Symmetry: C2
Subunit: 59 residues, 2 copies
Amino acid sequence: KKYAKSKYDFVARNSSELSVMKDDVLEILDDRRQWWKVRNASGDSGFVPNNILDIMRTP
Amino acid sequence: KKYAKSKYDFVARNSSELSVMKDDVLEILDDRRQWWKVRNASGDSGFVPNNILDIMRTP
């Protein structure tokens, strides 16, 4: 059972994000695995775990 | 534009998560800011940026 407290307010820019108020206590899920917000080829947007993604860059 | 390629498949379990297939090319949003999956006092699940949170621990 991992917990954290929000130091600042956070307003979700859309329904896929979660709004929180300063001092709110939250339970951290998935064992702190980190996520990135991404958009696919068809314009769909959402969160994906970043440990299975590889950044693409010029050689 | 910043892009990443998925190395494995990922099946969304929530409407805020985006299902992806191996080899899919995704556009990374929010300048790669890192997010955590959390659950609030109300029991709702969601994503919040991890840099506004202070970890909490009991001695």
